[PDB]
Amino acid sequence: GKRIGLFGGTFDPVHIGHMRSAVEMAEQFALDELRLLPNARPPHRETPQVSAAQRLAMVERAVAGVERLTVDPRELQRDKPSYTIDTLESVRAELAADDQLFMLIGWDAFCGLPTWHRWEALLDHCHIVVLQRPDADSEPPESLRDLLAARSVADPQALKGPGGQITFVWQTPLAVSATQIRALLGAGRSVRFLVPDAVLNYIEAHHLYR
Ligand SMILES: Nc1ncnc2c1ncn2[C@@H]1O[C@H](COP(=O)(O)OP(=O)(O)OP(=O)(O)O)[C@@H](O)[C@H]1O
Numbered sequence: 001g002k003r004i005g006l007f008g009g010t011f012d013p014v015h016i017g018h019m020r021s022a023v024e025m026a027e028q029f030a031l032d033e034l035r036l037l038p039n040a041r042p043p044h045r046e047t048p049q050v051s052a053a054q055r056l057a058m059v060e061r062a063v064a065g066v067e068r069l070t071v072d073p074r075e076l077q078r079d080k081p082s083y084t085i086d087t088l089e090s091v092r093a094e095l096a097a098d099d100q101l102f103m104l105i106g107w108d109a110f111c112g113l114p115t116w117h118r119w120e121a122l123l124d125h126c127h128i129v130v131l132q133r134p135d136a137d138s139e140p141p142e143s144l145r146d147l148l149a150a151r152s153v154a155d156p157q158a159l160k161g162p163g164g165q166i167t168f169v170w171q172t173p174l175a176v177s178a179t180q181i182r183a184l185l186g187a188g189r190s191v192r193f194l195v196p197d198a199v200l201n202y203i204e205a206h207h208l209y210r
Pocket residue numbers: 007008009010011012016017018021106173174175176177178179180
């Protein structure tokens with residue numbers, strides 16, 4: 001059907017590390033579309049004076065004019081956060097049944113997957129692609145050996161069908177951090193070139209991260 005990616009993050013703010021990983025994810029999987037999915041979180045876990053809807057605008061500024069990168073605001077429009085599985089069915093509810101869905105997660109995040117609500121069902125709806133990288137020691141928890149055993153493919157090209165498997169991918173993400181960027185901004189410095197230019201212009205224009 002279509003090759004559709006899903007890239008979830010808090011994005012506070014969205015920066016070139018995310019965007020450059022997005023770019024690479026797509027090109028590797030020949031995605032028709034890669035969807036950035038800003039997650040929703042309790043109001044009190046937002047950066048003070050940076051709202052959900054501003055996080056969402058920057059993500060929009062960042063993919064505007066960018067082919068095949070779009071934004072999915074559905075978590076960002078609920079009554080409160082959701083579990084991922086819930087996002088997944090909602091996404092899938094609007095898909096064609098042969099469309100292939102690829103959820104991109106980080107190694108460290110994948111390592112805590114058995115704590116996600118109803119985790120056993122996630123691969124019902126998508127493929128999970130796990131970012132491997134120089135900083136997260138590839139030592140899977142014993143709680144994930146049987147899952148990786150039943151559903152992982154060593155070749156990403158071998159992901160098949162609209163979902164059901166796990167593969168691993170290697171990237172060297174830029175040494176850009178949203179935490180570093182906030183501090184630079186708090187310190188009054190220039191994060192120019194550490195974030196997409198349309199994101200830079202938004203941060204500046206709206207005097208965000210103070
Ligand atoms: N440079 C990086 N390379 C690619 N993706 C990264 C990078 N840093 C974090 N991520 C991604 O960041 C996304 C959401 O923002 P997140 O706050 O988790 O990142 P962060 O840079 O570690 O921010 P923070 O510094 O506040 O922890 C995640 O979905 C994750 O994949």
